[model samples]
Target: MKSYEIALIGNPNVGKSTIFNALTGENVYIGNWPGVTVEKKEGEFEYNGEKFKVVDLPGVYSLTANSIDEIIARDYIINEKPDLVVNIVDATALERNLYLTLQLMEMGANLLLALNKMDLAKSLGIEIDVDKLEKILGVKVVPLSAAKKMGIEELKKAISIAVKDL
Candidate 1:
């Protein structure tokens, strides 16, 4: 069976670990980045008989090499080259979150945009047009509330479909 890495990357408190927990149902691998001493965690799960490994990169605003965390995240993507990157962005705070998404896209990896905290976005009267965003970014967009266990099945389905493309 083929394995895929659905790396979860985003800024702090963007619900990245929450989504990781929702998908893996296990604690993520927790540790510090080598040399730089930044923390990093990777989680793994099986879906459709294919291993789906997810690495939770340390939170950062942009991959500008200005911060150790951003550099670590960027190095992981550039060096390890995960199969697919699932960028979890805060919908309620779209502008700041979009910065990381743009940086990830610059890496030229196959990407999926997960608008996390959909409930929070809704409560704040912020409605993201997932389709429009998907079209704009040239990636699949999935609205999710990781805390509520919402859209996980759909997310998994999309992951499954993504793996089939490989």
Candidate 2:
């Protein structure tokens, strides 16, 4: 009975928490990290019948350790080496949202880019070729609106299949 662990990381207010809630549909437990008050959240949920433990890492704009949150995110990625790194970015502000996504990619390609707020992007006529983006990043690109509860099943499948190879 092996259960997979999935870690979600992203910039503040990028809807990582929303996606977590949508996927887990549970009252996620939030607590302070050991010896510190920095927030750490973990929840368990099943998607497509595959049970997974989800960890929500602190949000940050960078992983350079220049700030508390960044230090936390960077350390977790380097040390914990999560089964997957999901970079949720705001399509409305790609210029700023992309900085962290690029940083995550620097850690490795074991990442998925969730163009969160795709609805807004569509409404604003922001045409992003998700397929092209996937080829460029060599990772999954899920154009979804977590707030709308879209793409959860597809994302879970992508994650499960990706982890299967690793």
Candidate 3:
């Protein structure tokens, strides 16, 4: 089977876990992160014959090698080298969230931006022109509402396209 490794990284409460669960469904396992008490989550799902291995990295502001979580995330991206890093950016807080997104890009991570909470952003009168954002970031940004289970299929397609490019 064609296989892909994906690391989902984002700030706390950015709905990273929600997207993980939505993608992986019941095919998930949890354990403590290596040398730390922080929880680690990994799961796998198959789409159109491609097997996706998804890891939920502990949420942090940036991968600055300060806290254990940051180190874990940074090491995984740099060493383990997942096929893609799905950086879940909160649409309602683009500036702050994009900080980490930029850091991931600087780390040379192949990124797929899951702009979560699109519905909430709209409710809050925040208008995000996705095409413009994508052009600016130089990465594909998939607007989604994880809680509402929206744009998930598009995310899967984006993942497929990303993997093919790699």
Candidate 4:
């Protein structure tokens, strides 16, 4: 069996941990970042017989090396080089979220855009054309509602599919 390391990255309060918990269940490890108070989470799960090491990186607006969280996340991606950077984005605010997505792509990180809060996006009258966005970004997009547990399975499938290309 093969093993994989995946990082969950995004802006603050984008439900990164919520999805982490959902996917990993109870086997989650939490700790502080080195020389900082920011919390980092690590968990593991088996999907399709492949063991996945899920790391929930600290959230950041951009990987600009401006803040501790940004530094941690940026360094992790550039240094550790996880198999995939699953960018959990707020669908209600696509433009803001796209800012980070573009950065990830430029960094050449294998990416899977998770459009979180789809239900809220609908309630807020915000519509995201996932297909169009996927085409424009050249990355696969998965629409997800982490709170309501919607689209979790699809996200997993997308991750598996993304892994094949990596």
Candidate 5:
């Protein structure tokens, strides 16, 4: 089977791990980044006929190389160059989350935004125009509530559909 890889990145408490677990399931490989004690999580799932391996990056606020965690994530994207970088963001705090989104865009990584916590956003009446947002970002934005297992199929579909472009 062909291997397609994506990285999960976001601010701390953005539910990055939730979607990582949801997408990759339970058999995630636990390792350490070379020369660092930072934990690495890698897991694979089959989408249609291909395999997608996901790496859950350590959460960080900026990709400015200010912190070891940031450098760990920054270095991987620069080096490994995963097929996609799934920026799982908190919808309720879109403004705060978009900062990192712009950072990822600057890196020119083929990015797909997984807008997590739709359920919570809905309850709070935070309505985001998905299409407009997609246009503004120039990338696919799949809204999901990872806690409720919502929109995962759409996320996978977007991954499967868009990876060919990358």
Candidate 6:
């Protein structure tokens, strides 16, 4: 089975866990992170026959938050470290989300942005230029509202390409 390790990193209440459950379904294990007491979630999802092993990192607004939660996330990334980090960004609070996103990148992490809450963002009069954002940031961005369990495939397919296609 072709497989890859991936981590889902996001802020609190950004529906990060929803996407994990949506993508991994019953193939999930709630355990402890290797180096910390932080609750660890491990899951596997297949996209076009490629198995992606997923880990849900503790939610923090930014990596510099200076807590056990923040260090554990940094530890996981710096320690076992996945091939990719899927940063689930709350579209309603995109600016606040970018702080964590940027911190990951600064650590030389490969990332893909899951723009959750796109519908809510739009409804709240938030217009986004996804293509431009992607080009400018030089990273792939998938817009999917995980709140309604939507766009799970969209998120997977993009990661599929990133992991396999291109």
Backbone clash count, each prediction separately: 1, 0, 0, 0, 0, 0
lDDT tens digits, residue span 108-136, model 4: 89999999999999999887798998889
Models 1 onward score TM values of: 0.91, 0.90, 0.96, 0.95, 0.95, 0.93
Against the true structure, whose TM-score is highest?
Answer: 3
lDDT of each: 0.81, 0.79, 0.90, 0.87, 0.89, 0.86
Candidate 5, residue 142: how far the Cα is off, in Å: 0.3
Of the pair 5 and 6, which is ahead by TM-score? Answer: 5
Name every residue pair that clashes in candidate 6. none
- List the lowest-lDDT window of 10 residues for candidate 1: 157-166
Using TM-score as the measure, name the better of candidate 2 and candidate 4: 4
For model 2, how does the per-residue alpha-carbon lDDT over 87-160 read when each residue is reduced to its tens digit? 88887777786678788878773787778888888899987787877787677777788887787777777777
| lDDT, candidate 5, 1-166, per-residue tens | 9988889999888788888888886798999988989999999889998999999899988899999999999999989999999988889988888778898989888899999899999999989888999998889999999899899899999988878884
TM-score of 4: 0.95
Q: Compared with the true structure, what per-residue lDDT tens digits does model 6 show for residues 1-166?
A: 8889989999998899889888885868999966667799998887777789999999998787599889899977887868899999888888888789889999878889999998898899988888997998899999998877688889988887765434
As for lDDT, the candidate ahead, 2 or 3, is 3
Query: Against the hidden true structure, what lDDT does model 3 obtain?
Result: 0.90
User: Which candidate model has the greater lDDT, 4 or 5?
Assistant: 5
Structural RMSD, model 2: 1.8
Q: How accurate is candidate 2 locally (lDDT)?
A: 0.79
